[PDB]
Every structure is written in structure tokens, then in C-alpha cells.
């Protein structure tokens, strides 16, 4: 496989994301860490799909609505930034106030 | 009863910076091409050459703007700015290496300024 430590670290993000997706599908309101996990995993998957940075930033703000999470969580996250390998190299994607 | 952690409930009132000091207002014009950013606490005689103003008054004074904030000067754009005293020991060293000592010996500062071609000297 040949993995630098970065991939081993992002695998934890993917694990947290799938756990959060299971919890949300069950019918619970998410709290801060797994909401962050969902947002960052959607960003990474969208980057892998082949979207641009601007459209990724645009759709990052319409993935979680404020009534899917715990009370007061929307104020936890000012922004979320992640490293993602776009078809032309690794880039940093930052989305502000992702939940509103 | 919405809950937000780390939220502040600030009191009623206003914060004044540089209390009990004399305030001056001068006209600054940029005759250069590249835009110029100027900090708050940076001394106002060691500023860039291309700046044009009454350099004589701008000895031993600094910008009366909130700390960390900066003033921007576009090419060919002039504006009025506010200056206040530089308190404490009133000794200044370094920067552009023009004063390198007390601020009461303005003659040496002006002589070095017009020797090195600083604009606005009077």
C-alpha cells in the first residue's frame, strides 16, 4: 500500500465520519466532534470526486442544517479547513460558518 | 435561554485609547507608486521616503489608531491622520536609523533627514 503518516491520520477522520453517519441515520442530534467529522469527510470526498475549490466551498455550507445538531453547536464552528488531494495536487479547503 | 459557551456580556461604556494626551491632525500624501501600509506604534519620522507631509511636526509622535490596526495609502492618495505623543522615556533607537537617541534633539534628526533625501523636510 505505501502510506505516509498523513493517510494513516485521515483514516481516523473517515472512521469518525462513518460512525457519525450511523448515529445521524439512527435519529440522534449530533454534537461538535462528529459534526466536524461529517463536514470534513464530505469535503474530502467531494475533492476526490473532482470538484473545484470554489464549488467545494460553496456546497460546504449546505450539508448540515442547524436543526440536525445539538443545541448551541452551530456556534462551535467558525470554520473548518482540511487537506484534500484534488486531481492536480493537494490543496487546503476552508469553509466558514458551515452550519446555519 | 439559548446557551452559548465562552460568550461575553460586556458592560455599558466606551474604551478610550491614549487618555490625557495632546492630539494633532496632519495631512499625509503618497507621491509613490506602490501602496504603503503603516502600523500604529511605528514612529512617524522614520516612515518611508515617498511619504509627503510636515515632517517637522511628526517628531516624537505616533499614530492615534488602535494597536495592531494599520493605515493604508494608495498611490496618489492623500488623507488626514491623527497623531499623539510617544510616552515613557521618550528615547527611540533603530527603525530607519535617523534619531538613535532622544527626541528633543530634532535638529540632528532633520539634518540627517535632508541629508538622506527624506521628502517633506522643512
Amino acid at each position: 500500500m505505501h502510506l505516509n503518516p498523513a493517510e494513516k491520520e485521515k483514516l481516523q477522520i473517515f472512521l469518525a465520519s462513518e460512525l457519525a453517519l450511523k448515529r445521524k441515520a439512527r435519529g440522534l442530534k449530533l454534537n461538535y466532534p462528529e459534526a466536524v467529522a461529517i463536514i470534513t469527510s464530505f469535503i474530502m470526498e467531494g475533492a476526490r470526486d473532482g470538484k473545484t475549490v470554489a464549488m467545494l466551498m460553496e456546497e460546504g455550507k449546505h450539508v448540515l442544517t442547524r436543526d440536525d445538531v445539538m443545541e448551541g453547536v452551530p456556534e462551535m464552528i467558525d470554520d473548518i479547513q482540511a487537506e484534500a488531494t484534488f486531481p492536480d495536487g493537494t490543496k487546503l479547503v476552508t469553509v466558514h460558518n458551515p452550519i446555519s | 435561554n439559548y446557551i452559548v459557551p465562552g460568550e461575553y456580556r460586556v458592560a455599558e461604556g466606551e474604551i478610550e485609547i491614549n487618555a490625557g494626551r495632546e492630539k494633532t491632525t496632519i495631512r499625509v500624501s503618497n507621491t509613490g507608486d506602490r501602496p504603503i501600509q503603516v502600523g500604529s506604534h511605528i514612529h512617524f519620522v522614520e516612515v518611508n521616503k515617498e511619504l509627503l507631509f510636515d515632517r517637522a511636526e511628526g517628531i516624537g509622535r505616533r499614530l492615534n489608531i488602535p494597536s495592531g490596526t494599520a493605515a493604508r495609502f494608495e498611490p496618489g492618495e492623500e488623507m488626514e491622520v491623527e497623531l499623539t505623543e510617544l510616552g515613557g522615556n521618550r528615547e527611540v533607537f533603530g527603525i530607519s536609523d535617523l534619531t538613535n537617541g532622544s527626541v528633543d534633539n530634532k535638529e540632528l534628526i532633520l539634518q540627517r533627514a535632508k541629508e538622506l533625501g527624506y521628502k517633506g523636510v522643512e
Partner: protein, 570 residues
């Protein structure tokens, strides 16, 4: 010019009269005073004030008052008070509380806080800075628990144990000279301040003193070894001769005598009580009266704090499991009823609220969780504020008094008790540099930056492969202060005066800074800060009721509490 309060607070931090809320709780701290002067605030970054020829000096060398590190615009909260100021440390020692900057161009700069070319700047704008938490009940059973302790701003672990051993699991002791020397040698790899407690049992002075002369920092008297009054007498004699603290885990079976027998055995001396509430052990059921004596320093373990609707069942099950209790014998049932008693916990809530109990600890991996001492302390504080309402000393609708009293329970009071006050335990000049920086929204969950000895040791930091440090996943990682040979310089290992004078570190090859324990047998319950009340504690032998000042103490367990699932993944 005029500056609105909101923008100033957002860009620099709260000022006089501003209140800040600690996490999801309902607690607000109001800044009592401030040392900096408006308009002369110091901040770093591109185009900021701290530069050569500006508020950063550029002439003086290291010796001429030039600092080595400064935290700017921090918000100190200690037993001395709550105020916003700048922190300056040099050579790993806190040297200045005040405002930092060049006195050449600024006004009102404290003379000892000159910042020059050889300084480091850390921007603590909008962050809460606290002294390193002190832990007094740590069972050394796992070397990966030091990271869990560090994640809660704990910088001093004081306990015994040699790993996953039977006695190490049961009690926090380091029996004998050989084992204690081995533990001292193994202490080099732990990036934390460490104190080692030896076995405090025996029938002669010499075997007990041999441990203190080997490098012990205190003594533990646990029931499973045998807490006979003779052992208490011998340990106390060795202690006051050697000027070290003694921790007592009182008998629970009453096989050797009741509580009054132990009370006479101590004979009015100064002792430190472990888990005075009694769930973890003690004289069933009237142990808690030790909280009322003017010469006994109380403490508490975490798993009973605060009182929720699930403590009793889990406590009964762990008592079932650890001690191999069975349900085919009614003696085990009687033991469970006589040990886990809800009325006493409901009373301990108020006694913590009323300042009766002065400290708080963990008892890690020994019926107590290492990584939630501050968490559970603040949970108890918020629950008591919700239930019993505001205290009698509150003014202007602020919770300064409660915050000070509850923060004295895990930073300064254990330092007073253990005699290590003059090096650590508070933000004060002349003390070591062990600081914890929290974000206000994360206060009590995850420490943002833990700094030991002037070098950042732990941090909630993001991915190492990014161009900037924030991107996910942010996790707790040990910084450069816990790698290489730098660990030997940012840590203090506490050690007895007698064993220090004997050149024990030289014989062992110790390399960390060696700390001295002193001024320990001269103190009592009258010296603790904000928690110095002594009274009568009445425990009804049958009804298990608790009466204080002729009034029954009890509280109802709550179903939901903050500081909870809103933050944790699981």
C-alpha cells in the same frame, strides 16, 4: 479614539466589567481589575507593535532584564483573583506579572518585564490561563495515562505503584528502596512533575525511615496492608522527624478498632485524608467526620462527584467486580450497603459547596478516572450553583467567589498540603512555569496548550502535513518539550530533604531538576485558601443521616448536566 467594547473584546480580550462563560455551564467570571493600559496593548504578527525599534527592545542583552517568554493579554484566574494581564517567564521561572513592552516608547511598564531580542511571544488573546493542576492520588499502573493527565492541564502526579501489579492496583505505594530507586530511574521518561509515596507500614522506625532516605516524598497508610494504630504512630513519628506528609486510607472493616481509636492514634497531629467521603474506603459509616477536625486536610475522589442518577449502580457493580463479591452471600450485600450510601454523597455535594473539603483528586485506575478531575470539579461546581443558588459573598451578579473557591481545590490547596507550595501551584513570581491555556468554550474539556518550564509541552494541534497548523484532525499531541533531552529540563522531580542531602540523585544519575518538600508539618485546615472552615460532622450510625450545624444536608440527583456528551465523541 472611541472604541466599542465588543470590538475591543473580540480583538484583544475582555476588560474590566466583562463576564465570560465557562463552557456549556451557567458560570460567568467577571474581570475584577486589569493591569494593562488602553491603547498600549501588545500583540504580535505582521505589522503589529512587537518589532525592533518599537515596543520590542533591541539593545539590551539577555542579562539586562530581557525576558525569555511572554504570554500577551492573558486572563489569569487564580486564588489571588481574576484579572487580565501579561505573563513573563525567564529561565523557566515566572518572573513578571503585569504589562510587557519597551519602556522606551510605552508608559507604565513594570521594570522587570523588558522584552528584547532573545524573547518568545505567545498570543493568549481570549484564552483562560490557569496554573498546572496538582494530582495527589495517582496509581502508577499505565505509562500512557500521563498523556491523559496532560490533556486536562495536570502537571504534577503524586503517587506510587510499579505498573499492573496486584499491590500497585490496590494501593498507591512504592515498597522498599529497590523498587523506589527503580521508579525514580524510570521517571526520566515521563514528561510531568512526579512525586513518589512509599509504604508507611511496619513495627519499627528504621524500615520506614529507609524509604524516606531513599527518595520518597511522602507516606501512604492503606487498609489492605493493615492500618493498625501502631503503624500510624510509627509513620507519624517518621514523618514529623523527616518533615514529610502522610496519607491515610483508613480501615473499613473496623477489625483493629473504630474511628475514635485512629483519632487518638494520630493524637492531634497533621495528616492528609484520602477519599474522606468514604466510597473508596474508610471507617463505615462515620469516616466523614474527619472533614471537621482543625488538623486534618480533606480530599475527594472523582467518580462520586457530582451526584447523578447513575453513580450508585456503577459503584455497586465495580465493588462487585474488583473485590470478587458474590450475590450468594449476604455479607457482600451488607458490605455494599454499608459502603455506598447516597445520603453521604448528597451531603458531600454541599460540603464541597460550603468549603468543608479543601481539595480534590482522582485515584486513577483505582476506582477513579484520571482524565476528568477538572471536568468533574467544574461539573460539581455548576450543579451546586444550580441547586443551592448563589453564595452569600456574590456581588454584582458574578460568580467570582465560587470560581475562586472551586479552583483552589485542585491547584493551590494540594500544593499547601504536600509542602510543595514554594515552587508550583499558582501563577506567582518566583514559581515554576507550568501554565495551561484553555479556550473559553473548551474550558474543562481539552487543554489548548500545556506549557511546562517555559517550553510548550502539549497542544491540541492539527495535521502535520498541512501548510498551516489548524486543519483537521486536531488532536492532542506532545510538542517539542517532551522529546530528546529537553524533557530533563522542563520537569521537576520532588524529593525529601534528608534523601536529597545524601546525594541520592547523584548515585542514581538523576538528570531532572530536583524539588525539595518542606514546610509540611506546620500547617493545618486554618491555612487553606477559601476552604478553611472547621465544624462538627455528625453521622447517624443507623439512618446514615448527615447533620451540620443542626441541619440535615441532602440533594437530589440530576438527570442532565453540562460538560458532557455535547463535547465528547462517545
Amino acid at each position: 479614539m472611541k472604541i466599542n467594547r465588543q470590538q475591543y473584546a473580540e480583538s484583544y480580550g475582555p476588560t474590566v466589567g466583562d463576564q465570560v462563560r465557562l463552557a456549556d455551564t451557567d458560570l460567568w467570571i467577571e474581570v475584577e481589575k486589569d493591569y494593562t493600559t488602553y491603547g498600549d496593548e501588545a500583540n504580535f504578527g505582521g505589522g503589529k507593535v512587537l518589532r525592533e525599534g518599537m515596543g520590542e527592545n533591541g539593545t539590551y542583552t539577555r542579562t539586562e532584564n530581557v525576558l525569555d517568554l511572554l504570554l500577551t493579554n492573558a486572563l489569569i484566574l487564580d486564588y489571588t483573583g481574576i484579572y487580565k494581564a501579561d505573563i513573563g517567564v525567564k529561565d523557566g521561572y515566572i518572573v513578571g506579572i503585569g504589562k510587557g513592552g519597551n519602556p522606551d516608547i510605552m508608559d507604565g511598564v513594570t521594570p522587570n518585564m523588558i522584552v528584547g531580542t532573545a524573547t518568545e511571544v505567545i498570543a493568549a488573546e481570549g484564552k483562560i490561563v490557569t496554573a498546572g493542576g496538582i494530582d495527589t492520588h495517582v496509581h502508577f499502573i499505565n505509562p500512557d495515562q500521563v498523556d491523559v493527565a496532560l490533556a486536562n492541564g495536570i502537571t504534577t502526579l503524586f503517587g506510587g505503584g510499579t505498573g499492573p501489579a496486584e499491590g500497585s492496583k490496590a494501593t498507591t505505594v512504592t515498597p522498599g528502596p529497590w523498587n523506589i530507586e527503580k521508579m525514580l530511574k524510570s521517571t526520566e521518561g515521563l514528561p510531568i512533575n512526579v512525586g513518589i509515596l512509599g509504604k508507611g507500614h511496619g513495627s519499627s522506625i528504621a524500615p520506614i525511615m529507609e524509604q524516606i532516605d531513599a527518595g520518597a516524598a511522602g507516606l501512604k497508610i492503606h487498609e489492605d496492608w493493615g492500618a493498625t494504630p501502631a503503624s500510624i504512630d510509627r509513620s507519624l513519628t517518621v514523618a514529623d522527624e523527616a518533615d514529610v506528609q502522610v496519607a491515610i486510607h483508613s480501615d473499613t472493616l473496623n477489625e483493629a478498632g473504630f474511628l475514635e481509636d485512629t483519632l487518638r492514634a494520630i493524637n492531634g497531629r497533621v495528616i492528609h485524608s484520602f477519599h474522606v467521603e468514604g466510597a473508596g474506603g474508610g471507617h463505615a459509616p462515620d469516616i466523614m467526620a474527619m472533614a471537621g477536625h482543625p488538623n486534618v486536610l480533606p480530599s475527594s475522589t472523582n467518580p462520586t462527584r457530582p451526584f447523578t442518577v447513575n453513580t450508585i449502580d456503577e459503584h455497586l457493580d465495580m465493588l462487585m467486580v474488583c473485590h470478587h463479591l458474590k450475590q450468594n452471600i449476604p455479607e457482600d450485600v451488607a458490605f455494599a450497603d454499608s459502603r455506598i450510601r447516597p445520603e453521604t454523597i448528597a451531603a458531600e455535594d454541599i460540603l464541597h459547596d460550603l468549603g468543608i473539603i479543601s481539595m480534590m483528586s482522582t485515584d486513577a485506575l483505582a476506582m477513579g478516572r484520571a482524565g476528568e478531575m477538572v471536568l468533574r470539579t467544574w461539573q460539581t461546581a455548576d450543579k451546586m450553583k444550580k441547586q443551592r443558588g448563589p453564595l452569600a459573598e456574590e456581588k454584582n451578579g458574578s460568580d467570582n467567589f465560587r470560581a475562586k473557591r472551586y479552583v483552589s481545590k485542585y491547584t493551590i490547596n494540594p500544593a499547601i498540603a504536600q509542602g510543595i507550595a514554594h515552587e508550583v501551584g499558582s501563577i506567582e513570581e518566583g514559581k515554576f512555569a507550568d501554565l495551561v491555556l484553555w479556550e473559553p468554550k473548551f474550558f474543562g474539556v481539552k487543554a489548548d496548550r500545556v506549557i511546562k518550564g517555559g517550553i510548550i509541552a502539549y497542544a491540541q494541534i492539527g495535521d502535520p502535513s498541512a501548510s498551516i497548523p489548524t486543519p483537521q484532525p486536531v488532536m492532542g499531541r506532545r510538542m517539542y518539550g517532551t522529546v530528546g533531552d529537553l524533557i530533563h529540563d522542563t520537569n521537576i522531580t520532588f524529593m525529601s530533604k534528608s534523601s536529597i542531602q545524601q546525594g541520592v540523585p547523584a548515585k542514581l544519575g538523576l538528570k531532572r531538576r530536583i524539588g525539595t518538600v518542606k514546610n509540611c508539618r506546620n500547617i493545618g485546615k486554618k491555612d487553606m485558601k477559601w476552604n478553611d472552615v472547621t465544624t462538627d460532622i455528625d453521622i447517624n450510625p443507623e439512618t446514615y443521616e448527615v447533620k451540620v450545624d443542626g441541619e440535615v444536608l441532602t440533594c437530589e440527583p440530576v438527570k442532565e448536566l453540562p460538560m458532557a456528551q455535547r463535547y465528547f465523541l462517545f
